[PDB]
Amino acid sequence: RDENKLEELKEQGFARIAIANEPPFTAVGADGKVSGAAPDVAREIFKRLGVADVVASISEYGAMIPGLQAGRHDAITAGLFMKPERCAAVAYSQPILCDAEAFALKKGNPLGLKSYKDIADNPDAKIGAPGGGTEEKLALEAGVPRDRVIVVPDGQSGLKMLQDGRIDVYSLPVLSINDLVSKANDPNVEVLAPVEGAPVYCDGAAFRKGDEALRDAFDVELAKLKESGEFAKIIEPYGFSAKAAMSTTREKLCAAK
Numbered sequence: 001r002d003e004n005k006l007e008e009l010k011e012q013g014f015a016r017i018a019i020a021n022e023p024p025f026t027a028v029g030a031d032g033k034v035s036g037a038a039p040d041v042a043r044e045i046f047k048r049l050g051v052a053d054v055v056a057s058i059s060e061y062g063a064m065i066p067g068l069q070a071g072r073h074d075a076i077t078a079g080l081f082m083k084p085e086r087c088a089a090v091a092y093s094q095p096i097l098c099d100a101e102a103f104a105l106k107k108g109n110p111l112g113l114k115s116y117k118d119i120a121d122n123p124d125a126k127i128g129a130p131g132g133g134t135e136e137k138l139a140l141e142a143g144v145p146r147d148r149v150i151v152v153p154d155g156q157s158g159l160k161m162l163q164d165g166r167i168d169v170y171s172l173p174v175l176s177i178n179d180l181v182s183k184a185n186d187p188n189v190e191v192l193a194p195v196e197g198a199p200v201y202c203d204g205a206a207f208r209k210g211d212e213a214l215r216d217a218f219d220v221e222l223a224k225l226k227e228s229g230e231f232a233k234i235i236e237p238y239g240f241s242a243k244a245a246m247s248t249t250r251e252k253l254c255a256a257k
């Protein structure tokens with residue numbers, strides 16, 4: 001289950017992957033099929049490694065690394081963006097899904113919220129964000145107090161919380177917000193993208209430190225997918241940029257900048 005992880009996954013027939021259900025990063029249809037850019041890439045690569053299918057678990061973003069280190073899943077494939085502190089806890093693949101950050105906001109933006117700092121500087125402003133995710137951390141880092149950063153389980157709840165006036169802003173990656181609002185059919189909601197002063201992130205498939213040999217194998221296929229253009233064929237129908245991911249590396253994103 002360490003150096004010989006791939007072998008066991010092959011003779012097991014499947015790999016356990018962690019997702020959050022946030023299109024177009026991850027998605028689950030009523031059928032039960034797991035799609036989205038991250039699981040499709042993960043699915044294709046595992047297939048190439050002799051691993052016949054993926055079995056997915058839904059959880060919130062903050063439970064993913066703990067679940068991985070506890071050995072509950074074989075990889076995180078969910079748009080879990082590379083950050084120094086995350087990089088120190090897992091063995092990431094090379095970059096896959098890149099995106100900026102966005103705001104879902106009341107029409108006309110009554111509070112003038114354009115950066116995470118704007119939220120911090122207004123004591124009335126509450127921001128909705130996934131628990132343990134990048135947006136929550138960026139709000140906290142900009143100086144939004146804990147009790148004004150509100151944990152939101154998923155996009156549909158964030159939208160509803162915004163409509164109810166529980167939050168003044170809901171924050172996800174641009175592609176996630178765009179997808180959510182276009183399906184929302186709500187003239188009172190408005191998108192602000194990208195968030196001013198917020199970093200641009202890329203994710204990878206995240207593995208246990210002791211599963212680095214599996215990570216290497218996954219990466220050999222990722223690199224071949226990138227080289228052929230097949231990588232672009234999988235992720236770009238979802239709105240992602242292949243070039244962005246190919247323009248940087250794990251080490252650059254994991255660097256303390």
Ligand SMILES: CC1=N[C@H](C(=O)O)[C@@H](O)CN1
Pocket residue numbers: 022025061078079080081130132133134135136172173176
């Ligand atoms: C795809 C996605 N990634 C963020 C993260 O990696 O924390 C989450 O906070 C929100 N959605």
